[PDB]
Amino acid sequence: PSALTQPPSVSVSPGQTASITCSGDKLGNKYAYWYQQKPGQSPVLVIFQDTMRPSGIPERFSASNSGNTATLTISGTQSIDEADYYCQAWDSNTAVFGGGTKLTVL
Amino acid sequence: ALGKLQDVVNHNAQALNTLVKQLSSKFGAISSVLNDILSRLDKVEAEVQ
Amino acid sequence: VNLITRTQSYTNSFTRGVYYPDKVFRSSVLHSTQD
Amino acid sequence: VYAWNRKRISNCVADYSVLYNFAPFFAFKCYGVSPTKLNDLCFTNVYADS
Amino acid sequence: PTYGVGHQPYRVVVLSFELLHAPATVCGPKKSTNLVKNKCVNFNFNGLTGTGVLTESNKKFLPFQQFGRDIADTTDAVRDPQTLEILDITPCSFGGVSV
Amino acid sequence: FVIRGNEVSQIAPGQTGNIADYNYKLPDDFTGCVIAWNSNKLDSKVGGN
Numbered sequence: 001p002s003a004l005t006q007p008p009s010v011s012v013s014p015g016q017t018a019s020i021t022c023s024g025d026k027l028g029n030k031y032a033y034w035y036q037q038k039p040g041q042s043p044v045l046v047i048f049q050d051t052m053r054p055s056g057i058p059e060r061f062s063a064s065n066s067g068n069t070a071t072l073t074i075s076g077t078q079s080i081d082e083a084d085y086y087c088q089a090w091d092s093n094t095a096v097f098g099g100g101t102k103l104t105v106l
Numbered sequence: 107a108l109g110k111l112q113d114v115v116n117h118n119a120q121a122l123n124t125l126v127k128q129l130s131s132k133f134g135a136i137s138s139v140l141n142d143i144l145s146r147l148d149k150v151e152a153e154v155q
Numbered sequence: 156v157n158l159i160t161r162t163q164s165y166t167n168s169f170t171r172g173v174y175y176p177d178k179v180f181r182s183s184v185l186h187s188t189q190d
Numbered sequence: 191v192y193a194w195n196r197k198r199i200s201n202c203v204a205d206y207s208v209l210y211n212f213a214p215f216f217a218f219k220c221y222g223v224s225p226t227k228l229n230d231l232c233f234t235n236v237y238a239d240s
Numbered sequence: 241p242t243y244g245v246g247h248q249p250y251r252v253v254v255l256s257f258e259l260l261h262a263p264a265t266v267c268g269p270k271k272s273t274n275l276v277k278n279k280c281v282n283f284n285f286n287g288l289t290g291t292g293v294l295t296e297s298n299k300k301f302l303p304f305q306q307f308g309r310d311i312a313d314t315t316d317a318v319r320d321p322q323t324l325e326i327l328d329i330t331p332c333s334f335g336g337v338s339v
Numbered sequence: 340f341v342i343r344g345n346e347v348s349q350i351a352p353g354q355t356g357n358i359a360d361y362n363y364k365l366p367d368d369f370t371g372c373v374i375a376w377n378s379n380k381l382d383s384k385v386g387g388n
């Protein structure tokens with residue numbers, strides 16, 4: 001929509017499930033896009049069109065967008081998955097992003 | 107004396123009877139009876155008739 | 156190994172169980188389907 | 191063909207699925223009826239011209 | 241080998257497919273051109289042909305949906321099979337003429 | 340698969356017969372192609388296959 005709310009951090013041990021949430025006014029009515037940013041690295045798309053992964057993204061990544069909230073689910077969180085995850089949507093030919101969330105792997 | 111009203115009645119009755127008699131027309135099909143078409147032909151040919 | 160016991164009751168389905176009849180996007184329409 | 195034979199078939203049970211065993215033809219060519227519905231029908235008579 | 245034709249072995253291959261609107265993974269030999277938007281074009285999306293103007297759509301297709309149909313069962317929306325974007329189809333331009 | 344020549348007519352939507360009833364059945368709304376060819380030179384033997 002216009003403000004994609006996102007938790008500031010999520011703490012997950014290796015092998016557990018991370019659940020990063022993106023919220024916004026009727027977010028389920030639009031497509032959702034997730035990007036994985038690493039320190040000193042360019043953003044990398046991991047989820048497009050709600051629940052689709054680009055080729056090369058691990059099978060463990062998954063997402064949904066229902067109601068007014070989109071969630072990113074990293075099952076079996078590995079150490080590589082340490083990164084900053086973003087949430088994006090389009091509005092009137094303008095791209096809107098969320099605050100971001102640091103997935104910490106213990 | 108009431109020829110007009112009887113004419114209305116008769117026209118309606120003849121229309122319905124004509125509609126009933128039209129059910130024996132083949133209209134280019136092998137039979138005017140649906141059951142005979144279904145019993146004599148398989149699905150594909152029966153559908154044309 | 157027979158080790159599971161099952162009990163049953165009876166309830167109402169209300170209007171659950173509807174599914175998308177085909178794979179075509181539709182909008183602002185009343186679609187009749189037999190299935 | 192000029193002196194073609196006609197044989198009358200009557201008072202019997204006709205299983206037409208056995209005709210594929212007596213002769214190696216590829217298919218029936220039927221008129222007013224389909225070959226796969228013959229076993230479901232009754233006829234006053236049958237004539238076999240050969 | 242001495243059997244008549246009707247009594248001889250025949251090898252049969254039956255090919256069954258689906259021509260209904262759905263994403264496709266088997267296609268014939270056909271080179272794809274570029275995608276033109278905002279002009280009246282003839283188009284061919286996975287065999288679905290037509291004429292009209294293609295514009296960017298906000299319709300939210302589900303992942304199993306490739307086409308969108310209108311009241312008259314005419315395709316007015318299509319997912320692009322390469323970019324996966326949703327496109328609206330609109331008839332080019334027309335109108336009655338009186339003299 | 341392999342059948343005999345006079346059964347090839349059974350490989351079609353809406354058919355009946357031993358092959359169509361007990362071996363291989365096509366739906367009435369079948370969309371596709373049936374390709375059949377004689378294979379007497381590979382599937383026949385002097386003593387019978």
Ligand SMILES: *[C@@H]1O[C@H](CO)[C@@H](O)[C@H](O)[C@H]1NC(C)=O
Pocket residue numbers: 026029
């Ligand atoms: C469809 O989504 C738009 C997006 O904001 C929303 O305004 C509209 O109310 C939605 N329609 C329905 C029927 O919920």
